[PDB]
Paper text:
Abortive infection (Abi) is a bacterial antiphage defense strategy involving suicide of the infected cell. Some Abi pathways involve polymerases that are related to reverse transcriptases. They are unique in the way they combine the ability to synthesize DNA in a template-independent manner with protein priming. Here, we report crystal and cryo-electron microscopy structures of two Abi polymerases: AbiK and Abi-P2. Both proteins adopt a bilobal structure with an RT-like domain that comprises palm and fingers subdomains and a unique helical domain.
We also obtained Abi-P2 crystals that diffracted X-rays to 3.1 Å. The crystal structure was solved by molecular replacement using the low resolution cryo-EM map. In the crystal structure of Abi-P2, no electron density was observed for the DNA, in agreement with the low Abs260/Abs280 ratio for this protein after purification. Abi-P2 adopts a trimeric arrangement that is similar to Ll-AbiK. The asymmetric unit for the crystal structure contained six protein molecules that were arranged similarly to Ll-AbiK hexamers as two trimers stacked back-to-back. Therefore, Abi-P2 also has the potential to adopt a hexameric architecture. The absence of DNA in the structure precluded identification of the tyrosine residue that is responsible for polymerization initiation. Two tyrosine residues (Tyr46 and Tyr61) are present in the region of Abi-P2 that corresponds to the region of AbiK that comprises its priming tyrosine. We individually substituted these two tyrosines with phenylalanine. The Y46F variant retained wild-type levels of activity, whereas the Y61F variant did not polymerize DNA, showing that the hydroxyl group of the latter residue is involved in DNA synthesis priming.
Numbering used by the authors:
A (entry chain A): 32 to 157, 170 to 213, 223 to 465, 468 to 541
B (entry chain C): 32 to 104, 107 to 159, 170 to 215, 223 to 237, 241 to 464, 468 to 540
C (entry chain D): 32 to 158, 170 to 213, 222 to 238, 242 to 463, 470 to 484, 487 to 540
Write the structure that this text describes.
């Protein structure tokens, strides 16, 4: 498969306009932004519309749509950004321009010449992870390991560092620096998170830290080592404890120039490479007992959810429970056992927000057993489920996946989410779809009835972001196949 | 099925005169007290005998038979209530002049919507407990849980409190009927091991539910649910401040009944799913299924250390008996079988509740090795007796060795019940009732028409149903253990 | 089968001349010392060569070859001795003579009279739960408490002069012929490796048993039983006070032999079933069976860190080898295989006892990956040898690494002697010293002995090609 850099300019624009590359959220399948991005693209190419930004016009206006995922802790959240589709296609068309994309593709090819390092996180155009398989394999060659991570790589990048990538001291770097400035209030504070476009930018400076670390490396003559990397997750292998310490002090020096540093918690020099190549949550998943009883397995999942809270391994181990739900036929003692399993899975979600897709699928399929067709009694248990889970402060990701099950059981009866009310407009077949408080067009010059803004408003209000053809083909309950792609 | 309060007087006395109703001991299946208790009922019915006790006639006499079960470790005392006094005390309760107003008090417990009980006696017929499955389902509604027990509930029930579940003010009712007759058989406590004594506990526990509901409605605390099983309390609320105020009212209403809370088992939880199952139930789920017999039996032994004297070990041992009965041939009988006998002998040495299932696999393990050689098999069973005889109680052991030794040989006991069962098994004439139950309180000397016609009914009536004994297996079957 | 003392004089020599009896060291199947020693015997019986020892001539000369096994700890190693073949067949013929053999068998038979003491570690002619563990488990039916100990360093601390005290009292003795024949073959305790030493160790061990029962019958203590394996004691009784006076008597009789009990492994156990099995065996039952190859091999690595250099881990790598041999085609050789080669390489680089089985899974794994291309495989074996040569001693590595290397293509005196017999060239140089023989190499006596050592092959070429390319589970299950 082709990575982002060994493909052509026309292929890079077509790749960046995919709903996959636009935003990598745990979103239902019926949401698809490809047609909207590909319509506003060809409209700029056909000169039907014109996108022309200005730092003065853009300063002081919030542009994007931010969705909050709890990630971990439940007192902290991650700000995933839905970039304005108008500014996104324009910003994709500008870096995919052959004048600068030629420089970008060859800058990545220079990272491949850095032969000591291995970046397994470069985006690609579509067992165990390669980051782990590459670490277990090099134990045959090296005995020691240095694992580390970056505190907030995406939120702490000094945006002016992009200029330091292509040129040194004092170019596509200034182009990148200037346009993350146009969004996010011209603060140079951070870069957005939740897009392949933003990931491709991160790997440019990640590979540049890789370039500059090798430059300090060769000056001190330490060339018998290897590095396996995935985003900010660094793993340096060598057979000399003295070398790793020097490489660590050089890696903290190069990060000191880009305004970053190592996570003191997740930074350690290791002697058992095989032990520390896997996460502790993935190790305990191996030892979990295989159960045939549903309640025995589901209760075992909850206990696993305490030792490893808000972990994606809990979703994998919950997804396999959902695999066995569709395989079973009759659920004996539905009046007693099903009610008990509902309270179990409701508590797993009340403490682990990452399990909203699977947990809603668990709550949906178990209710198709207790109430076959009586959707009225089904809706009361979801409202009971929502009343509990809504006690958390930021529950927008719940409302989106709660809507997937809601839309297939009853469309006639207020989600309070700008995206969810937009989906509901396209689900209820409304005349014009809402765009207010979803994406701000105030940066575009003119009035709402101006020949340009009203023409762009026609695209935002008529283009469907929901594949109603796929939605009608989707099953009544959430299937494991819809969640299996989230890994 | 129907509850104990959903029965009329004609079938309430029928339920109370069942062997399961009379005692709840882990007695073998060839001792059914149904024929004795139902025939002495007819004697009072057709005026053959007269049974009317008096506080002065009965004060100072140990009327009932007592069997000690260690429970954990500290040993409980289950009471085999005197059959004469039992049927008199059940007929007076099932009298329609009082049974109509005892079940009426049970019906008022049903109107208490916030409280949910599952420990009411149920007229039975010929996985996951409801106490846990109900609490697991309540995590959808509530988030906090308050779980306590009543410390020594049965041994410390104030006897005069039975009058308080009907009328509050006391001066010079079914409460006095129960308060007066319980003090006659005992002399402060309540006997254990009978479902009649459980129905009395549910009335005083149900009144606690009613009185707590009156105290919680005056304080305007409405959003909570209670799941109760006898002593075990579980209160569910979404408010940590409401939950520890209902607690302060529970200790007040239990403080007026001479009761208290087990402070060692009193806790306010947050994970309802976590503390809905006991620790023994959780670790039982995690256990690896071993195909090897010695590997599994050794794993069961290690479980008994981390969970001393628990019914989960009996359930985990009963699965090993099901595996033994499935086997038809075992190999390496020399070193492997002898090592397994030593493993189970150590389990019973520290887990007294494993006496039935421990003797079960021991007799089944011996038949796999020594075969039909009754001499070598019986001598090894006596070697097991000598080891376990060091423990203080072991009265239940003699009850269950009697079931094992009788099916392979005949002729000890050293127990009034064991010698009586042995007399009924060997088919003698006069069954020994001399030291089993004290009938001295029956006014009149021997040979008199009342005591002699009662002695004729205590000696000639068979409590050991021999047709069932002749239909069982030589070794203890897993089905027998499953009934307990 | 029959024990070592239940064999007559003629077969006792045939037993001591067997390769699995000459050495218990885990060696490849193509090594067979049965041909060399048994042909040296027939040379002594035919008077073609006469081995005459002298305490003055043998003094100041290392007569034997030694191979180091790490055992455990990795900073400590145990010296396994391949006794000199000439001195071995001589010293084997000396005690197996009917005059001195009848006295030894009459002594081992006296150990049978000690009904309270049962030994399951006497050497026996060949053909789950070990008997030391199964017997200790069944005794829980009779007794309640247990007292398990181990002599601190039994073999290396035996006073060689104590072999007389097992046949005489204080001060022509049969045990005296052993005190002088061990102090001659080594610069003056008992060596390690040969079953001849196991029989000598069991002599005084049975005498510790006889002398202990004298002190316990004197103190009117009799209601107890003892299960023993070599120096591993397990004393059972129903009286904790009796057990402390039995142990206090065991340290006395052991102190009379200059022997010590390990303080670290000494405890009066309240629970027999709990401590009847080693901890590594108890955790082996707790391990979850895995259908995935990598999930199993990673679980093996985790087990080796809680029980380092354990023979229980060897059994559990052997299960992995049996599963590899069953699989016809491998699943995803590009990524999954290269990782498993690193897992086993890290296990062998910290658990030296896993050198044989580990080399086996290394080779079988490369056959699934690189296939029949031996050039691409040899570069990985060199990568494995480099990672493991960082260990200090190795040697045992090189022995089991020849078995894989020499089977596909052609450091120590032993591994080059095997190399000589695989090229049909046989230099006995620097392997067994012969300088304790009168005359030079030109003299007929020494020249005739060099001929028998050089002509007889210690490697059976008919078995080498008969063996498989990779080390099979049937080879590692013997050890």
């Amino acid at each position: 498969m082709k990575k982002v850099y060994e493909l052509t300019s026309e292929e890079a624009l077509s790749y960046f306009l995919r709903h996959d590359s636009y935003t990598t959220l745990e979103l239902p399948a019926y949401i698809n932004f490809t047609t909207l991005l590909n319509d506003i693209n060809s409209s700029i190419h056909n000169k039907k519309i014109k996108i022309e930004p200005t730092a003065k016009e853009l300063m002081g206006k919030d542009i994007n749509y931010e969705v909050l995922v709890s990630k971990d802790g439940l007192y902290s959240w991650r700000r995933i950004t839905l970039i304005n589709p108008l500014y996104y296609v324009y910003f994709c068309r500008k870096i995919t321009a052959p004048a600068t994309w030629e420089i970008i593709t060859e800058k990545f090819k220079s990272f491949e010449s850095n032969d000591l390092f291995t970046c397994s996180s470069i985006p690609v155009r579509k067992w165990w992870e390669d980051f782990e398989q590459k670490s277990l394999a090099l134990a045959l060659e090296y005995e020691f390991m240095f694992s580390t991570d970056i505190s907030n790589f995406y939120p702490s990048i000094y945006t002016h560092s992009f200029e330091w990538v292509f040129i040194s001291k004092e170019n596509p770097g200034g182009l990148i620096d200037s346009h993350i400035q146009m969004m996010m209030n011209n603060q140079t504070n951070g870069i957005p998170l939740g897009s392949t476009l933003m990931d491709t930018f991160a790997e440019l400076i990640l590979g540049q830290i890789d370039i500059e670390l090798r430059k300090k490396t060769n000056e001190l003559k330490i060339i018998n080592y290897k590095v396996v990397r995935y985003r900010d997750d660094y793993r340096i292998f060598s057979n000399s404890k003295d070398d790793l310490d020097i490489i660590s002090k050089c890696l903290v020096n190069v990060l000191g120039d880009f305004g970053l540093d190592l996570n003191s918690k997740k930074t350690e020099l290791y002697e058992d490479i095989i032990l520390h190549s896997l996460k502790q949550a993935k190790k305990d998943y191996i030892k979990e007992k295989r159960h045939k009883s549903l309640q025995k397995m589901l209760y075992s999942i909850y206990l696993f959810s305490l030792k490893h809270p808000n972990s994606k391994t809990t979703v994998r181990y919950l997804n396999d429970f959902l695999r066995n739900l569709f395989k079973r036929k009759t659920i004996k003692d539905n009046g007693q056992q099903v009610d008990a399993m509902l309270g179990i899975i409701s508590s797993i979600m009340a403490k682990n927000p990452t399990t909203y897709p699977v947990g809603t699928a668990i709550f949906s399929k178990l209710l198709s057993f207790l109430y076959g067709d009586d959707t009225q009694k089904k809706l009361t248990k979801l409202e009971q489920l929502h009343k509990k889970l809504d006690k958390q402060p930021n529950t927008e990701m719940l409302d989106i996946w709660f809507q997937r099950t809601q839309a297939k059981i009853n469309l006639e009866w207020s989600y309070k989410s700008a995206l969810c009310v937009r989906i509901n407009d396209e689900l209820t077949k409304e005349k014009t779809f809402s765009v207010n408080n979803l994406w701000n067009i105030d940066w575009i010059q003119g009035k709402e009835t101006s020949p340009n803004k009203a023409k762009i408003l026609s695209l935002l209000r008529k283009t469907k972001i929901v594949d109603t053809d796929k939605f009608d083909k989707m099953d009544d309950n959430i299937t494991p196949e819809e969640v299996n792609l989230f890994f």
